[PDB]
């Protein structure tokens, strides 16, 4: 029911980091029109067509006042997390 957040208006509030409990966590700041559903994905390097972000937060959103937290699992190897156009490389251990 929400539109997708404008993919040009994200920056990192807390960059991708290890959560302890075998997941990857991150926070984003969004400066555009709210509320909206956060477009999030990830790819294995050299495999741009296949999303590999397995979302633990399955419907991340920016609300009128809050939102921005994303948790995912990723496969081992060199990955890139995208939140809209915002990216961050994430190497995942086996």
């Amino acid at each position, epitope marked *: 029911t929400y*539109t*997708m957040c*404008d*993919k*040009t*208006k994200f920056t990192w509030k807390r960059a991708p980091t290890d959560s302890g409990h075998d997941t990857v966590v991150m926070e984003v700041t969004f*400066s*555009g*029109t*709210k*509320p*909206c559903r956060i477009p999030v994905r990830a790819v294995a390097h050299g495999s741009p067509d296949v999303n590999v972000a397995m979302l633990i937060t399955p419907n991340p959103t920016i609300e*009128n006042n809050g939102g921005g937290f994303i948790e995912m699992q990723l496969p081992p190897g060199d990955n890139i997390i995208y939140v*809209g156009e915002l990216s961050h490389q994430w190497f995942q251990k086996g």
Partner: antibody
Framework: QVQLVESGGGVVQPGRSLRLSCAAS????????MHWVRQAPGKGLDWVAV????????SYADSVEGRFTISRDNSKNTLYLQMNSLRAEDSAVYYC?????????????WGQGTLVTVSS | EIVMTQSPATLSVSPGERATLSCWAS??????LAWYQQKPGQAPRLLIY???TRATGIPARFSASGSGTEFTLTISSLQSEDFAVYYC?????????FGQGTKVEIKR
């Protein structure tokens, strides 16, 4: 360079239907959100609908929700507004408006507008 | 939804003088506030986005400021082409909402 040409305006009887289009040139249409704004004779500007660059996202003003459908053909660089169940108070100049980004306002470029007159 | 109010409805200023236009939001819209100019019989034109950033090809006598619920547009040294209707628009929250406009007319 950037041009937005609307067409499809005209007279339509109450309760019937109209499709507007807006042909874009001079920019990469498929990278940008597009909006419809309307302006009744002598009144202020009135936001109608938005569609994201990739057509996945649409939103409507409350006064037209459930009656209007916005869509776009990115291989034809064309934006559409399908207007059903038209009322006299839908009479307005309708503008297509480009977003500088993927979906959000503001509106950086505007068409010249097309006149919709809902009347018997 | 957010209600955008502009004040005053009409402003009469002489050429060369300064015009200050106000825009009020019923709740905070941060800095996601735009200003448009519309001359009689023409499409509107973007002037200001992000509350204070000038759009391209907008001259420097247009400036704007504000955040949250109060915004002003200032036109310094009104030139005859500056006389028109000005609309604010919040785009912090869907649906984006225009204010009702302020007519800037030439005082004589």
């Amino acid at each position: 360079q950037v041009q937005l040409v609307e067409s499809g305006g005209g007279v339509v009887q109450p309760g019937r239907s109209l499709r507007l289009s807006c042909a874009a040139s001079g920019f990469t249409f498929s990278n940008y959100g597009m909006h419809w704004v309307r302006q009744a004779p002598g009144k202020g500007l009135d936001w109608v609908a938005v569609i994201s660059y990739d057509a996945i996202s649409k939103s409507y003003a409350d006064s037209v929700e459930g009656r209007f459908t916005i869509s776009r053909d990115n291989s034809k660089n064309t934006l559409y507004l399908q207007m059903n169940s038209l009322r006299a108070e839908d009479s307005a100049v309708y503008y297509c408006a480009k977003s500088p980004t993927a979906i959000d306002p503001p509106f950086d470029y505007w068409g010249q507008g097309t006149l919709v007159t809902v009347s018997s | 939804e957010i209600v955008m109010t502009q004040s005053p409805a009409t402003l009469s200023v002489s050429p060369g003088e300064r015009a200050t236009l106000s825009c009020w939001a019923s709740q905070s819209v941060s800095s996601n506030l735009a200003w448009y100019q519309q001359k009689p019989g023409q499409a509107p034109r973007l002037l200001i986005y992000g509350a204070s950033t000038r759009a391209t090809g907008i001259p420097a006598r247009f400036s704007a400021s504000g955040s949250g619920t109060e915004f002003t547009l200032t036109i310094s040294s009104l030139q005859s082409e500056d006389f028109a209707v000005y609309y604010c628009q919040q785009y912090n929250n869907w649906p984006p909402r225009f204010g009702q406009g302020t007519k800037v007319e030439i005082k004589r």
